[PDB]
Amino acid sequence: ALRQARKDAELTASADSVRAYLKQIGKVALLNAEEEVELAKRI
Amino acid sequence: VNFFDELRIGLATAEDIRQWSYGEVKKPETINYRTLKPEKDGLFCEKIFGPTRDWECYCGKYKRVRFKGIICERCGVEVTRAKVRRERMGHIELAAPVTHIWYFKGVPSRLGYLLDLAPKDLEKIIYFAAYVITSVD
Amino acid sequence: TDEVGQALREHYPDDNPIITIVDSGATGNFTQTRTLAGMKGLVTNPKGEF
Amino acid sequence: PGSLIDRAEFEAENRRVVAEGGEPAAGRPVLMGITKASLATDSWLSAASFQETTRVLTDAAINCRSDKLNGLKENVIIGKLIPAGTGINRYRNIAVQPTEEARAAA
Amino acid sequence: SSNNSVPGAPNRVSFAKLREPLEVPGLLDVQTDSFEWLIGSPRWRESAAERGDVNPVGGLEEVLYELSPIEDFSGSMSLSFSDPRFDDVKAPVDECKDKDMTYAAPLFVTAEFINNNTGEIKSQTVFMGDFPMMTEKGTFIINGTERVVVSQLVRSPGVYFDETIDKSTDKTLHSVKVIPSRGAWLEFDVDKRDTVGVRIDRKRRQPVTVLLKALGWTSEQIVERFGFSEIMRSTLEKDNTVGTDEALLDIYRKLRPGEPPTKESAQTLLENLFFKEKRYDLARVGRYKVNKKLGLHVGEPITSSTLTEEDVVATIEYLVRLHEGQTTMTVPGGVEVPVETDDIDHFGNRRLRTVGELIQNQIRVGMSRMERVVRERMTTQDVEAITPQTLINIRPVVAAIKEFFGTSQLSQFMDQNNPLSGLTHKRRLSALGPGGLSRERAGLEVRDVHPSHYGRMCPIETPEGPNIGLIGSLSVYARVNPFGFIETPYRKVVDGVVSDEIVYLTADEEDRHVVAQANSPIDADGRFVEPRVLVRRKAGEVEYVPSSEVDYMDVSPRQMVSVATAMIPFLEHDDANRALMGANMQRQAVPLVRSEAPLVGTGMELRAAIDAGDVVVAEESGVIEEVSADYITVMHDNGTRRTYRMRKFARSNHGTCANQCPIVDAGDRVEAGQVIADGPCTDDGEMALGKNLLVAIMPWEGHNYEDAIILSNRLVEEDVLTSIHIEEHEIDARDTKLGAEEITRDIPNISDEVLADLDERGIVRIGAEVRDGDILVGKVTPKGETELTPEERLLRAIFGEKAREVRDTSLKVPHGESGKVIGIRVFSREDEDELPAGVNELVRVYVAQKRKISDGDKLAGRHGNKGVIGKILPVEDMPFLADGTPVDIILNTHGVPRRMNIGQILETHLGWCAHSGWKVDAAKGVPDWAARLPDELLEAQPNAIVSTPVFDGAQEAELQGLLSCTLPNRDGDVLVDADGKAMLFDGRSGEPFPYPVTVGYMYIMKLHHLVDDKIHARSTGPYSMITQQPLGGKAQFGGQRFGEMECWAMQAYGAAYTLQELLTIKSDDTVGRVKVYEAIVKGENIPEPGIPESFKVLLKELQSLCLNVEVLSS
Amino acid sequence: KLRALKRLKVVAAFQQSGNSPMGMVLDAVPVIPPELRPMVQLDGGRFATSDLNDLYRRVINRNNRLKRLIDLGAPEIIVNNEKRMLQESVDALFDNGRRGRPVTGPGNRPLKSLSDLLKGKQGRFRQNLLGKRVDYSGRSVIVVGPQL
Amino acid sequence: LRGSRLGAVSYETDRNHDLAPRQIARYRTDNGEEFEVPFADDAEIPGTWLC
Ligand SMILES: [Zn+2]
């Protein structure tokens, strides 16, 4: 229902392409300090 | 020279485009701000497109018609007339392939008919919104 | 309008310069003479009606 | 099927195709408007300069349609002599010499 | 009779049979009152107190109050504005005009920063910027130039219910467009089926029930509100969605496509779009329109500029009852309103954004930009260290004002050919511009004359070009409703006694009530005479009501007409096309050197000059102390003296003279409001755009063939039609890369013969006559070092002359121009004058010429006749009367009957009657025709001025009677018989013409379409930039466009080589044009054309688009 | 049937002549000669671009940035966004006003691409090619010459 | 509204009857492309050339 409409809106054209880039970047969330330390040690 | 009889428009290829050009513009500059002379490898470069003045190279090595049809060894601009700046073309070597807009967007879409793809979906392909499979085994 | 125009037509002499110009074929139809003297007639709506 | 082609070309193709095995293509006369008749011409320069320049240009580029430069518009665009009036070869190539009797008189 | 007002008037006898209850208003009130409403001037304050005292509020106050307060997202602080206030202007009008500085005054605003959490007020007086100020004449002065803000007709915000028919169904489909200002629309439509579409923001319709449940109406409340409505209950069944939030989510999906919906977001966004006023504001006019159309509030003040649920549900129910075919309708809490469709062009729905509204809108958008900046910097800046000085940024506001007054289609260049054009450029309504329809978007139905234009907008005067109906002008008596509508005066009649209580109505009250006609028999008591009376109803119908239901009456005739059109005598005899032409070309006359007043005219010759501003008016009564050609010093009754400065030979905005010479003497006593000095086209107070010329109406020798006009040489000898045209040339000595140029006498190669006129330091001496191509400003620039051609080197050394590294670019006067040099105005950086960046010395030279009349200049009377002058005959070969007086011009007869403009005939006849003077010998009573003539008209003097008002003038019988007795000139000689014709003698051959010919005195102007501005030629000149075509426009040499149609015309002839020439070797063959010039000079044959530089540019562009457009040779 | 007819009108077009359909996609973009997109010094030391220089500058900027991104080593998201902008810049260069919004300049004025110079009533194809300003010409107001 | 391309047109007349003699050099890229450059005779030949 509501989640179905969410998934339907997840697949739209978005001809602006800045809105498309924003919906693309919306996929990945933030991180906090300890995982930053872990990533730095790994790299 | 006249003797014009036919004009044949046609889809140009990359090998034709980089055969038309006399150079490869690779810098987004036009004119030096202070001396008001075109930049090297820019959108107005004398080496690529021809001399701004008549029978003069960029460093002024060869300033006479006696020196014509030749290229100055240092600055690289070929010494000729100044009307060649209206005719000589350039080219840009793209680092990634791009699609022409006339054969994708103009209804009826020609890429769509050639590939049997819907434009509502072809737009999702060529603007990096959806994947396609180029080969399945 | 028709009958006013007919009365005006039968009233004028032949040497009258307005009707002399009109009847010569030089310029102008008789309706302009009818509007000059007599009756303007029926005038149209902005939509097209009368 | 459904495509529109010139009557002369249709007849010529039928004369060619009655030989080498005979089969006729069936054709029906059509009355088309002036816009579509003008746009469906043989020369791409004139049609492109008329109307709907983008689509005419792109489908002419696809078809590789070679113009032959024989109308009164494509001869105006490229600046050479038009094929009407004093431009046709019947009048453009007149040899003018003084007459024999008056050449002898001179 | 006469005028009986504006002291110092010429005694101009009037043919006005009726009375004039209301004098014409202050003609320029539409500009001045609007601007002082914007400012909040005390005169406007007391006028508003007289006419609506409850809310005396200026436009700056409104934008400031709607702006105040400004809070951050935290809500812990706020910023507010109050008390707009002006200083005096920094410079007077004339100094502003001379020194190219805009006429402005600073704006001071009291800003207050308030903190919430700790609590302080930071009050200041922030300089908001210079604000342009309108002068006394209704014009702004920007950058020295004079500009006029033209009032704009727009479509007022509100509710507009309209219907269409569907030929596929034959049903009436009704709809509404609730159009706000800067908001989002919503349309409620009834489609082909019996459902109702509620399309909100342009996107894919809606049934009502979704929107009703969105606001919070359950199905039971929808039944209760819409029970009788069959369509509404059908859509309630068709709802296919139950639950308010179930409708809200669908609305959010339809309105936010590509957004994750949440309950709070959908709950708040619908309120945001229509109820949160920051993104939705239908203005004061829109609120008044909606609550008057729907009758929601009656006595309540105008507030809450957003919508409300009551308004929306009332709109829906109004639509459904209007589809039901109801007549009236009561909404709970409001008085009932009639159910009707609304006209898109009725003046109750078409409002007028005047100059004040436009400047207020521009200030509003500038304040919006500044508010965005200020609320950005409220947060980033540290608290307890700031003040409104640090927060306010005035650059976007002044940028918005400067962008409005310069480079906007409504901030038009002031058009001064004659004072009348100055008056009529103002008081002009334009329906095109920003926020209005453009000419390509303009339909045919907007360009007509709705029957609501009567008394609010003249149906005659519109531009004849591609703007007909989009540009018109206000009526004479029109006044502007404070809400932007156009009121009109009317005389109230109660129970059949015509009172004098003049009441102003807009178009709506003109619909409700019923209107009579001024030319009706009032029996000297306010009482009508005949019961059966000419009357207008609501929808433009004309009927015969009895003389008991008439409640309102027109103030006067000529109320429907504009200012310029009211100055046409015998207008009611002219056709509307030729009247339109006469009105449009009455504003194009040029100021002559003499400017003699017309013989026959109207009452608007005097009041269109004292109001236009170009006539100096004695401010307060007194005696003249002293006069000159430069100033008038008046002695007021109480001590004070005042010096009125003139404006001698000042250039207008179109090159015409603007002389002002006094008409008072050293001992005369003047009263307040009296004309004290005539203007460009003024004569003893009243307008004079042309001259009175002796006119015959015969076709003479084919020179007056097809609108051509012949003149006497008499008009050339005595300078009757002769204008003084003043042209302005300018040149600046800027900076450059190689150095700096200098205005000097050290010019490169030119003989010292042409340096005689120049003074010691460049520019010419004052009064030195110049021809085309002469040197005006000696100015030379550096060039650098270019290697010479060898033969130039040899030729230089042969005469020993040096390289002369500098290059001359002097100010040469352009081709086809001559005349004296009046004045030289020179700026400099050394005097510390305001010059743009990188400019050292500016100088302007004013070159004037006395343009006489010639063959080709355009002449015209007041009734749409017009023509180029065919031939200037000598005085002897012109048809002269029996007394030897030659006629001055000869019009054609064949243009008169077919154009239906016989007013020029009548104006001719009365003209002669006004010149010879009449005397009605009332020995045995008064003759029958002269019974209703006013007194002191039974006799008149020679050259006595007269006046016929527009729609009550000389009757034809009265013209016959006046023409019967036209007392002789000097001998016993009645030259013009009772018929109005005379026996002309052929001045060329000698024999008298066999038939009598119409002669009279006609008033004719000189239009600003002179030959010297139009004649143009080019053999070779400048060339265009990207394409190598010749330039054009006559500003350069320029060439004529040999367009596509001429190409077809030459193809049809079979002309091949001429077409090849005109398209190859005269336009684009870059190597071929030098060849054709060489071949012509050397006498050789014209070279064969090559390929044009147009086809090659096309080829290179086609190759640039990845299209291999190759040519195969053969 | 009808879909087959419309497709074959494009498929058979590529089969009859010698055009490979590879030219539909683009690898090297040609640049119009400088004098057809001139940079002129107006009187007053100003400058006037021909409005194609900005589009070419955008294309070169995005292509060079893509080259640097790929050479350095960049994530899939950034590289794909850069490729999409390269596509949009080329699209704007060839035809403005087709996909998305018209690429605007100062004053919110749409830019003039290569298509907007061929197209239009004022484009080369219609006029400035059929009708031209001409030398050896003049104009004047006219009067009647009844003795000629 | 004057304008210039920041260039100068020389009104010189073609002198094809004699030009300074011009030598011709052949440059080659890495990928097998050949280019011919008519360099000046009394001039140095740069082995590395932008082709
Ligand atoms: Zn060099």
From Swiss-Prot, chain C:
Assembly: The RNAP catalytic core consists of 2 alpha, 1 beta, 1 beta' and 1 omega subunit. When a sigma factor is associated with the core the holoenzyme is formed, which can initiate transcription.
Similarity comment: Belongs to the RNA polymerase beta' chain family.
According to its UniProt entry, what is the function of this protein? DNA-dependent RNA polymerase catalyzes the transcription of DNA into RNA using the four ribonucleoside triphosphates as substrates.
The molecule here is called DNA-directed RNA polymerase subunit beta'
Name the gene that codes for it. Answer: rpoC
Q: Which residues of the full protein are shown?
A: 782 to 831 of 1316
UniProtKB/Swiss-Prot annotation, chain D:
Coiled-coil region(s) at which residues? Answer: none
Question: Transmembrane stretches, by residue range?
Answer: none
Complex and partners:
The RNAP catalytic core consists of 2 alpha, 1 beta, 1 beta' and 1 omega subunit. When a sigma factor is associated with the core the holoenzyme is formed, which can initiate transcription.
Question: Function of this protein?
Answer: DNA-dependent RNA polymerase catalyzes the transcription of DNA into RNA using the four ribonucleoside triphosphates as substrates.
The text of the family note is:
Belongs to the RNA polymerase beta' chain family.
Q: What is this protein called?
A: DNA-directed RNA polymerase subunit beta'
Q: Which organism is it from?
A: Mycobacterium bovis (strain ATCC BAA-935 / AF2122/97)
Lineage start: Bacteria, Bacillati, Actinomycetota, Actinomycetes, Mycobacteriales
UniProtKB/Swiss-Prot annotation, chain E:
Check the record and name the Pfam families matching this protein: RNA_pol_Rpb2_1, RNA_pol_Rpb2_2, RNA_pol_Rpb2_3, RNA_pol_Rpb2_45, RNA_pol_Rpb2_6, RNA_pol_Rpb2_7
Enzyme Commission number(s) of this protein:
2.7.7.6
> Under the GO molecular function aspect, what terms does this record hold?
DNA binding; DNA-directed RNA polymerase activity; ribonucleoside binding
Q: What are the annotated GO cellular component locations?
A: DNA-directed RNA polymerase complex
Catalysis: reaction(s): RNA(n) + a ribonucleoside 5'-triphosphate = RNA(n+1) + diphosphate
One of the GO biological process terms = DNA-templated transcription
| InterPro entries in the cross-refs | DNA-dir_RNA_pol_bsu_ext_1_sf, DNA-dir_RNA_pol_bsu_external_1, DNA-dir_RNA_pol_su2, DNA-dir_RNAP_su2_dom, DNA-dir_RNAP_su2_hyb_sf, RNA_pol_bsu_bac, RNA_pol_bsu_CS, RNA_pol_bsu_protrusion
Instruction: Identify the keywords attached in UniProt to this record, alphabetized.
Output: DNA-directed RNA polymerase, Nucleotidyltransferase, Transcription, Transferase
Top-rank taxon, per record: Bacteria
Its annotated function is as follows: DNA-dependent RNA polymerase catalyzes the transcription of DNA into RNA using the four ribonucleoside triphosphates as substrates.
* Record family assignment: Belongs to the RNA polymerase beta chain family.
Q: Subunit composition?
A: The RNAP catalytic core consists of 2 alpha, 1 beta, 1 beta' and 1 omega subunit. When a sigma factor is associated with the core the holoenzyme is formed, which can initiate transcription.
* Protein's UniProt name: DNA-directed RNA polymerase subunit beta
What does the record give as the organism's lineage?
Bacteria, Bacillati, Actinomycetota, Actinomycetes, Mycobacteriales
In the UniProt record, the gene name given for this protein reads rpoB
From Swiss-Prot, chain G:
Superkingdom classification of source = Bacteria
| Family statement drawn from the similarity comment of this UniProt entry | Belongs to the RNA polymerase-binding protein RbpA family.
Q: What's this protein's function? A: Binds to RNA polymerase (RNAP), stimulating transcription from principal, but not alternative sigma factor promoters.
What binding partners and quaternary form does the record give? Forms a complex with the RNAP catalytic core and with free principal sigma factors.
Task: Please report the name of this protein according to its UniProt entry.
Answer: RNA polymerase-binding protein RbpA
The range of the complete sequence contained here reads 6 to 56 of 111
